[PDB]
Each structure stands twice: as structure tokens, then as C-alpha cells.
Design a protein around this ligand. Structure first.
Ligand SMILES: *[C@@H]1O[C@H](CO)[C@@H](O[C@@H]2O[C@H](CO)[C@@H](O)[C@H](O)[C@H]2NC(C)=O)[C@H](O)[C@H]1NC(C)=O
Ligand SMILES: *[C@@H]1O[C@H](CO)[C@@H](O[C@@H]2O[C@H](CO)[C@@H](O)[C@H](O)[C@H]2NC(C)=O)[C@H](O)[C@H]1NC(C)=O
Ligand SMILES: *[C@@H]1O[C@H](CO)[C@@H](O[C@@H]2O[C@H](CO)[C@@H](O)[C@H](O)[C@H]2NC(C)=O)[C@H](O)[C@H]1NC(C)=O
Ligand SMILES: *[C@@H]1O[C@H](CO)[C@@H](O)[C@H](O)[C@H]1NC(C)=O
Ligand SMILES: *[C@@H]1O[C@H](CO)[C@@H](O)[C@H](O)[C@H]1NC(C)=O
Ligand SMILES: *[C@@H]1O[C@H](CO)[C@@H](O)[C@H](O)[C@H]1NC(C)=O
Ligand SMILES: *[C@@H]1O[C@H](CO)[C@@H](O)[C@H](O)[C@H]1NC(C)=O
Lengths: 296, 186, 68, 307
């Protein structure tokens, strides 16, 4: 039993005879006779200013590139060719002669592992069926030779979940408890009491007389629910900074004591209002502890 | 049990040699301790399950021994202990990890309705069957054994006298043939 | 094809008004079985009914037997 | 007429190991994946217990092929079974079965018994009707009718008393039987502790469940018993350790619960096998085993269903 990226059984594989997203992994089959199908581009834009993997299977050699600024370069309808591309980069494949898409079963022995770590969101074929892969739990039946002769897609239908539960491919008659149904929560609710009792910055910020810098006034704010949106969200202030917090985090945490000192300073000496600050306003009038926690 | 050897239980690897080959003593001790805790708990669960299951099996084995004694080595009266029917005999057949009894029983098969009475008035005497029941085919009265219709004629040998006609509820009437009267007459 | 039984919601089994010996027990009296063919859910049957012809002077006495 | 109470089945329960342990949380569930197949074998154990309960009831009661029914005319020689025969008006339970049914009072789920109480009552009614109308013959083959007085005369022969002794004392015996049944009614109606054997069973399971749920309220050494709060207060490297402590504790609580249930289900199965044996040898026939079927020389037995 393996949990990996696979092609959900019976899924609608798109048929082409353009560029396609890669969402999480791509199955690629092609029924070919004339071998127009050569190669692949993968990437995010496939235009320059980003790295877009290129693969070419040209007639003797397998050019593989991550281009300039190239970071890597590897070198090496009866045709049913199957390929799997997942992300570093791993390609599996297979090739059978068949005589649209065939009923039956065959595994895909890997071919290549490009340790490249590209960012891929789109891809195109270099001149077939495109499937996408999902995170599914399969139950694989390794035969005596060590080959995969059958699989079970454990989310195809109830019977498949049964078989996976028993770790068996044949189910005797009975009732089996295979899973657990749960009604999921459809939404979230956040409720608290009314939002009264705000710290009165209306006395500190909406005052009428800003006292001296040397004799700076210090009032207490505490035992409230302090609005932190207004001060940092108003554009009226010419300076809003903090030295110990995220100033965009005040509306969550809580504090034992809040102190607010107000002073009138020269604009130029305003910079001297900070932890670890030097100057007359900084030393002789108001010194901020080098590890001061709060805001200016 | 075996599968529980593949679980990390929190360690960095279920394989003990990997932890040993990838870590020094002071840290491998921590990881190996996590493994030891998990695997020890797995053994304990296995052993507890086995103890309970073995108790159930020996209850079954004591029952099998009882069936062998009372059922093969004898003839049981205990109802449905030795098969559905009146037990006749049993034969034990060995099977892998167990035993199989073939219970030979007697099942009454083809049955008839009869009219019945608890006693019989003869001379102001009440006669009861020694063993059997009084049955009437419609006109005449016989006494039969209870488990197989075999009517004999009612005589003073099939029956015993007790009391008189005026107490039993449902008593009826017939001759009760006396075998010795013809001999005293002949 | 959805049937609400005392044991829960049964989906994909065809409710029936008959009653048979329990094949697959579902619970609270309901069984289910495979019987064109489909899966049916029914209240189980305790056994074929019978009524002994009791009367105060009737007796039934076997006239034959079978060794079983 | 004495009374014997026997437990037969427990409550079928099942526990979704992952809700109990990691209730509605993915960090916890992925930590729990490391413990292997503990949860699946807990569920396997509990499922075995539940199936066993259904088998216990099936063995005790479903011992009758057909469903016999008493005739509308009730001339049973003077005996009056009206207090054990089913009540057509009422769940078609008898009077005494009604006394009995009255006198007994997170990821966890309770499964319903396979045989509903109505079907259990039909089973015991069938056994009762078969016994009354046919004697012990219905348990050995085809039910053969026999007048009840004559059946009881057979049983008197069975205990070694000549059968003239019944026919000559039929009214007296019938009166004593009817009186004894009335006293059964009174003895049950008055005192509750009589059904302790059954009631205890219920209590035990209930207690064992409460304890289980209460274990969700323990730290087991973590900083909190609330998985969400551990999650929302600590950074994943440390929340993982605290959650590991919680998972170990809760998983051990489940293992304790399941082991207790297994041992208890062994007790109940032993009792249910005893009850099945008593049904067979004691209701379906007349027993020579001493004190297997009450104190005295056994004549007949009457099965009544109870919770
Ligand atoms: C009812 O019982 C009487 C016994 O008296 C049976 O009568 C005998 O029947 C056999 C065969 O039918 C004759 O050979 C005898 O001569 C009869 N004897 C008398 C006295 O009648 C009668 O057959 C029984 N009824 C049935 C249906 O078997
Ligand atoms: C059974 O036989 C007895 C014979 O002893 C019948 O008893 C007689 O019945 C008649 C009328 O019922 C009375 O006048 C006699 O005095 C009775 N004699 C005795 C000794 O009881 C009895 O009636 C018969 N049963 C039936 C149903 O007829
Ligand atoms: C069998 O016993 C029951 C006792 O419950 C008798 O029922 C009572 O019968 C009397 C008179 O028939 C009534 O006044 C009571 O109300 C009945 N009580 C109940 C609970 O039914 C019944 O009569 C008895 N059977 C016979 C034939 O006497
Ligand atoms: C494995 O392959 C060989 C061919 O080399 C074949 O003989 C054998 O049957 C195969 N085993 C199975 C189980 O098919
Ligand atoms: C006895 O008679 C009743 C009805 O009179 C009938 O139902 C029953 O089958 C009869 N017994 C036999 C063995 O035929
Ligand atoms: C048996 O029942 C019938 C009902 O038809 C009745 O006439 C008869 O008197 C009863 N016999 C006894 C002994 O009570
Ligand atoms: C008893 O049944 C057998 C068949 O099982 C039959 O051959 C035989 O004749 C029957 N006996 C009587 C007396 O009818």
C-alpha cells in the first residue's frame, strides 16, 4: 500500500490531436505511428526571464537542458508510449505495441531523475493524451517476478475502499466497516462581548497642550481594550514606529502596563526619540532604554 | 506484530542499524529508547490478546472434552447437548486444531392425531398406564408408548389401578381386558 | 434509492416488504442480501410460523422416525 | 417457582481511535501515524466484541425453528399462564417482561443490537407457547401437542412421582402454581435489587465509558489537556513534544478500555453460554441435573426476556 501521486482510475484524460498547466504532475500518453512527438518544454512562463526545462529526443540523442544561463545539460497507432512527469524532476515511462486508450494494465518503470528543482506550472509538447496526477493511496499487487500486475485505487468507489482495508483483492461476502464519515464544519464563528472600554488615547493624542521635552508628561493607559488601528492607520502622523513589537501586531497581544509620555521637540531632533539614541533630547531630557519596548 | 517493526514510534527510523550507523551514543540512546518503548508496547498488546484468546480456546477445549466424555463415551440426556434430537451416539473425527463430532440422533418423523385420556374407568376404578399413553383411533382405546405409535390392547398389565372414577378430570371408559380370566375359564 | 433504517442510512440497497432468514446482518432487525439481481434490505424473519393444534384431549404421536 | 437472572449481552460500542486521540486536528493525526497500526487493531478488537454480543443473543434465544403460538382457548388443565404469555394489547411483551423492562434503568458510538427487543419477545413467546402446547417434544423434532395436564403428569413421572399423584391432586397443584406465579410478580415489583445481575452489567459499561471520556481531560504531563491550546500557544518543535505526551496518554487510555472490554466480554460470553445451556436443558426439556434449574426437583422452566 503506497500513498503517492497517481492517475485516478477511470478519470477523464484530455485528448489532443497548446500549453497546458502541470498542476501537480502529468500523465502523458501518445498513440503514435509517425513519431511527430519529439519533446517537451516545461516551466512557468516558457518565455525568458525564468528557467524553463527543455527536453528533446532527436533521432539519436536526448538533449536535456535547463536554459542562456544554463544550469544543467544531460545527453544520452501501434506505438502506445506512456510517460509520467512529477516533481526534483522524475520521469517514468513505458512503451507497448497495441492493436482509443487500451483496456489492460501495465506498470511504468522509471527512466530519469533530474536533480534540478525548477519551478514548473505550465508545459507544452514538441511535435496524445494528457492526464493529471492526484495524491492517492494505491494498493499494488507485486507478482512473483516483482512486477506490478494489478492495482487498486483506494478512493474509486466503496468496493475499492473495502479491498484496501482488507489489504486484499478478493472480498468474501459480509459487511465491513471501512471508513468514518464526518460532517465537515461549513464555516467559522468568532464571538466575543461588546468592544467597549478602549484605552483613552483621546487624552494623549487629542489633547490641547504638548508639554516640554525636558519636562515630558507621562500618563497611564491600562485596564482597557486599546484600539491599535487608529494610530497606525491614520496618515495624519508624520512618524509612527515601534522598537520591540510589530506595529501591525498590537491589535492581538496584551500588556500589563501602558505608559504614554508626550513632549514637544524640534523636528530635526525627532530622530533622537528611539532606543539607543544620543543627544540633549536623548540624554539630558529623555533617554530611552536601549531595549525599550513600545512605540514612538 | 511483525508490521509493528516498521514504525518509528517517533524515532528517526524504524531500522535500528540506521540509528546505530548514523548517530553517536548520547543521541542514539534517545532514538533507540523511543523504538524500545514502542516495540515493547506492541509485544505486550500481542501477549495480552493471546492470553485472552487462549482462555477462550480452553473454554472450548473443556467443552469438547465434556462432549467427548458425555457424548461419545456414553449416551446423554442433556437436551441439545449432543445434537438436535434424542441422542443415540456420537463419533469423534480429528480435524486440524479441533475435533468434529458426528452426533447420531433419533428424530420422530411421521405423526398422527389421536384422542387421549388420562385414565380409564373400569369398575369404578381408575386405571393409569404403566408406561405410555391411552390413545383412541376414534372408536377403540389402546395404550401406546409415547415416542412411537405402537398400540397394544389395554390390559391389567399395561395399567395400574389407583383411586376410583370420581376424582380424575377427563377420565373415560373401556373394558380393561384381564388376561387371566380366560385361563381361569379354560 | 436511499433507505433510513434504525441503524443508519442505507444507500444502494433496495427496500423490500418480504422477510427472509438473515443473510448479512445490518442491525436493529434489518438484514441485506444479494438476490435483475441486486441488493435488498428487509426486516429479518424469525422463522416460519406454526401453531400446534392444542386441545384438552388431542395428542400427536409419531408413527415413524429418522436417524439423523 | 423460583427466578434466575442471567446476563446475555453487553452494549456494542465502537470508538473512532483518531477522534478520541487526535480529535479534529491534522498535526495530531500525522503524529499519530507514527504509531503504526494501533488504531486499526483497537477497532478490530471492539468489532469482535460487538459481533460476539449478537452471537450471544442468537444462541440463547434463537433455539426454536418455528414460531409457535398459543391457541386462543386457554384450557390448560387449570393452570393460568396469563402473566407470562404475551400481552396482545401492549410491544407484545408479557406482564412479567414489562416489570423487568421497567426495573432496569468524542468519537464514541453505540451500535444497535441485531435483534430488537420485539424480536427477542417473539422468541420467548415462541418457546413459551411450544412448551405449553407440546411439552419437550418441540425441541427434539416436530412439535407434538399434548394436554397440559398430561404433560405435567409426564413430568411428575420424570421426577419419580407416580402420575396418579398429579391427576388426583390436579386442582391443588394448579392452585399452587398460580399462586407461585403471583408471588413472582410481587417479588419483582417490590424490590429492585433482584435484577442487580443485569443492572450491574449496564452500570459497568457506563462507568467504563465515562472514565474513558474523562481521560480526555488529563495533561499526562503536557502543558494542557486541550490539544488546540497546545497547538495555538507553542511553536511546532515544542508543540510536537507536548502533543506526543498527549497522544501517548490517550492511546494508553484506549488500550486500557479495550482490554477491560475484552475481559468483560469473556465474562459475558461465559454467562451467555450458561444461559443457552439452561434454555436447552431446562426449558426445552426436563433436567435431572441437581440444582441446575432451581432448588427442588425440576418440573418445567419459563423463559422471560429482560434488558
Ligand atoms: C379402531 O380400533 C378398532 C379396534 O377394535 C379397529 O378394529 C379392527 O380393525 C382391524 C383392521 O381394520 C380388523 O381386522 C379388526 O377385526 C377390527 N376389530 C374390531 C373389534 O373392529 C379399527 O380398525 C380401528 N380404526 C382404524 C381406523 O384403524
Ligand atoms: C364412564 O363409565 C362409567 C361407568 O362406571 C359411567 O358412570 C355412570 O354414569 C351414569 C350416567 O352418567 C350414572 O347413572 C352411573 O351412576 C355412573 N356410574 C358410576 C360408577 O360412575 C360414566 O358415565 C361413563 N362416562 C361417560 C362419559 O358416559
Ligand atoms: C388468570 O389470572 C389473571 C390474574 O391477573 C386473572 O385476571 C383477573 O381476572 C379477574 C376476574 O376474571 C378480574 O376481575 C381481574 O381484573 C383480572 N386481572 C387481570 C390483571 O387480568 C384471570 O381471570 C385468570 N384467569 C382465569 C381463567 O381465572
Ligand atoms: C517471470 O518471468 C519469466 C520470464 O523470464 C517467466 O518464465 C515467469 O513465468 C515469470 N513469472 C511470473 C510469476 O509470471
Ligand atoms: C391434527 O389436527 C389439526 C386440526 O384438527 C391439524 O392442524 C394437524 O395437522 C393434525 N395433525 C396431523 C399430524 O395431521
Ligand atoms: C375439553 O374441552 C372441551 C371443549 O370443547 C370441553 O367440552 C370439555 O369438557 C373439556 N374437557 C375437560 C376434561 O375439561
Ligand atoms: C418410515 O419412513 C421410511 C422412509 O424414511 C419408509 O420407508 C417406511 O415405510 C416408513 N414406515 C412406515 C411404517 O410408514
Amino acid at each position: 500500500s503506497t500513498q503517492d501521486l497517481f492517475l485516478p482510475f477511470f478519470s477523464n484524460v484530455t485528448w489532443f490531436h497548446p500549453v497546458l498547466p502541470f498542476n501537480d504532475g502529468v500523465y502523458f500518453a501518445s498513440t503514435e505511428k509517425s513519431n511527430i512527438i519529439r519533446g517537451w518544454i516545461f516551466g512557468t512562463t516558457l518565455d525568458s526571464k525564468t528557467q524553463s526545462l527543455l527536453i528533446v529526443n532527436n533521432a539519436t540523442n536526448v538533449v536535456i537542458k535547463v536554459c542562456n544561463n544554463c544550469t544543467f545539460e544531460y545527453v544520452s497507432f501501434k506505438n502506445l508510449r506512456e510517460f509520467v512527469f512529477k516533481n526534483y524532476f522524475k520521469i517514468y515511462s513505458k512503451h507497448t505495441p497495441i492493436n482509443d486508450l487500451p483496456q489492460g494494465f501495465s506498470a511504468l518503470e522509471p527512466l530519469v531523475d533530474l536533480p534540478i528543482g525548477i519551478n514548473i506550472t505550465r508545459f507544452q509538447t514538441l511535435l496524445y493524451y494528457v492526464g493529471y496526477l492526484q495524491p492517492r493511496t494505491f494498493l499494488l499487487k507485486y507478482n512473483e517476478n516483482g512486477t506490478i500486475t494489478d492495482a487498486v485505487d483506494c478512493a474509486l468507489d466503496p468496493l475499492s475502499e473495502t479491498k484496501c482495508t482488507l489489504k486484499s483483492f478478493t472480498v468474501e461476502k459480509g459487511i465491513y466497516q471501512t471508513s468514518n464519515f464526518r460532517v465537515q464544519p461549513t464555516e467559522s464563528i468568532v464571538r466575543f462581548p461588546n468592544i467597549t472600554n478602549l484605552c483613552p488615547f483621546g487624552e494623549v493624542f487629542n489633547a490641547t497642550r504638548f508639554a516640554s521635552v525636558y519636562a515630558w508628561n507621562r500618563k497611564r493607559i491600562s485596564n482597557c481594550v486599546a484600539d491599535y488601528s487608529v494610530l497606525y492607520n491614520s496618515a495624519s502622523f508624520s512618524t509612527f514606529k515601534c522598537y520591540g513589537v510589530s506595529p501591525t501586531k498590537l491589535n492581538d497581544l496584551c500588556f500589563t502596563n501602558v505608559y504614554a509620555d508626550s513632549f514637544v521637540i524640534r523636528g530635526d531632533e525627532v530622530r533622537q526619540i528611539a532606543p539607543g539614541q544620543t543627544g540633549k533630547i536623548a540624554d539630558y531630557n529623555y533617554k530611552l532604554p536601549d531595549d525599550f519596548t513600545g512605540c514612538v | 506484530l511483525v508490521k509493528q517493526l516498521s514504525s518509528n514510534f517517533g524515532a528517526i527510523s524504524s531500522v535500528l542499524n540506521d540509528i546505530l550507523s548514523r548517530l553517536d551514543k548520547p543521541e542514539a540512546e534517545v532514538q533507540i529508547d523511543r523504538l524500545i518503548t514502542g516495540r515493547l508496547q506492541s509485544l505486550q498488546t500481542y501477549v495480552t490478546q493471546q492470553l485472552i484468546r487462549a482462555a477462550e480456546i480452553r473454554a472450548s477445549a473443556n467443552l469438547a472434552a465434556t462432549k467427548m466424555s458425555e457424548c461419545v463415551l456414553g449416551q446423554s440426556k442433556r437436551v441439545d447437548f449432543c445434537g438436535k434430537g434424542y441422542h443415540l451416539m456420537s463419533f469423534p473425527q480429528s480435524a486440524p486444531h479441533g475435533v468434529v463430532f458426528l452426533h447420531v440422533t433419533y428424530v420422530p418423523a411421521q405423526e398422527k392425531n389421536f384422542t387421549t385420556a388420562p385414565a380409564i374407568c373400569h369398575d369404578g376404578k381408575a386405571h393409569f398406564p404403566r408406561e405410555g399413553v391411552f390413545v383412541s383411533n376414534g372408536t377403540h382405546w389402546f395404550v401406546t408408548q409415547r415416542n412411537f405409535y405402537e398400540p397394544q390392547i389395554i390390559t391389567t398389565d399395561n395399567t395400574f389401578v389407583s383411586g376410583n372414577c370420581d376424582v380424575v378430570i377427563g377420565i373415560v371408559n373401556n373394558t380393561v381386558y384381564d388376561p387371566l380370566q380366560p385361563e381361569l375359564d379354560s | 434509492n436511499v433507505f433510513q433504517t434504525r441503524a443508519g442510512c442505507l444507500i444502494g440497497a433496495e427496500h423490500v416488504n418480504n422477510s427472509y432468514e438473515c443473510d448479512i446482518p445490518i442491525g436493529a432487525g434489518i438484514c441485506a442480501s444479494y438476490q435483475s439481481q441486486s441488493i435488498i434490505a428487509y426486516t429479518m424473519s424469525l422463522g416460519a410460523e406454526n401453531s400446534v393444534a392444542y386441545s384438552n384431549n388431542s395428542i400427536a404421536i409419531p408413527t415413524n422416525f429418522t436417524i439423523s | 417457582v423460583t427466578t434466575e437472572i442471567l446476563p446475555v449481552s453487553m452494549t456494542k460500542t465502537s470508538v473512532d481511535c483518531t477522534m478520541y486521540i487526535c480529535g479534529d486536528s491534522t498535526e495530531c493525526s500525522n503524529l499519530l501515524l507514527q504509531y503504526g497500526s494501533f488504531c486499526t487493531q483497537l477497532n478490530r478488537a471492539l468489532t469482535g466484541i460487538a459481533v460476539e454480543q449478537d452471537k450471544n443473543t442468537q444462541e440463547v434465544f434463537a433455539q426454536v425453528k418455528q414460531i409457535y403460538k398459543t391457541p386462543p382457548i386457554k384450557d390448560f388443565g387449570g393452570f393460568n399462564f396469563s402473566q407470562i404469555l404475551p400481552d396482545p394489547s401492549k410491544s407484545k411483551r408479557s406482564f412479567i417482561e414489562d416489570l423487568l423492562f421497567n426495573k432496569v434503568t468524542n468519537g464514541l458510538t453505540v451500535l444497535p443490537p441485531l435483534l430488537t427487543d420485539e424480536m427477542i419477545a417473539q422468541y420467548t413467546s415462541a418457546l413459551l407457547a411450544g412448551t405449553i402446547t407440546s411439552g419437550w417434544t418441540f425441541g427434539a423434532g416436530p412439535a407434538l401437542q399434548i394436554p397440559f395436564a398430561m404433560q405435567m403428569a409426564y413430568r411428575f413421572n420424570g421426577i419419580g412421582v407416580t402420575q396418579n399423584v398429579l391427576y388426583e391432586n390436579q386442582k391443588l397443584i394448579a392452585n399452587q402454581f398460580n399462586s407461585a406465579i403471583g408471588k413472582i410478580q410481587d417479588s419483582l415489583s417490590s424490590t429492585p435489587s433482584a435484577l442487580g445481575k443485569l443492572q450491574d452489567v449496564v452500570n459497568q459499561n457506563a462507568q467504563a465509558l465515562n472514565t474513558l471520556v474523562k481521560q480526555l481531560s488529563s495533561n499526562f504531563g503536557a502543558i494542557s489537556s486541550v490539544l488546540n491550546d497546545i497547538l495555538s500557544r507553542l511553536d511546532k518543535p515544542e508543540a510536537e513534544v507536548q502533543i506526543d505526551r498527549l497522544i501517548t496518554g490517550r492511546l494508553q487510555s484506549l488500550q486500557t478500555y479495550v482490554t477491560q472490554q475484552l475481559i468483560r466480554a469473556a465474562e459475558i460470553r461465559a454467562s451467555a453460554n450458561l444461559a443457552a445451556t439452561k434454555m436447552s436443558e431446562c426449558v426445552l426439556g426436563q433436567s435431572k441435573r441437581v440444582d441446575f434449574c432451581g432448588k427442588g426437583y425440576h418440573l418445567m422452566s419459563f423463559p422471560q426476556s429482560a434488558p
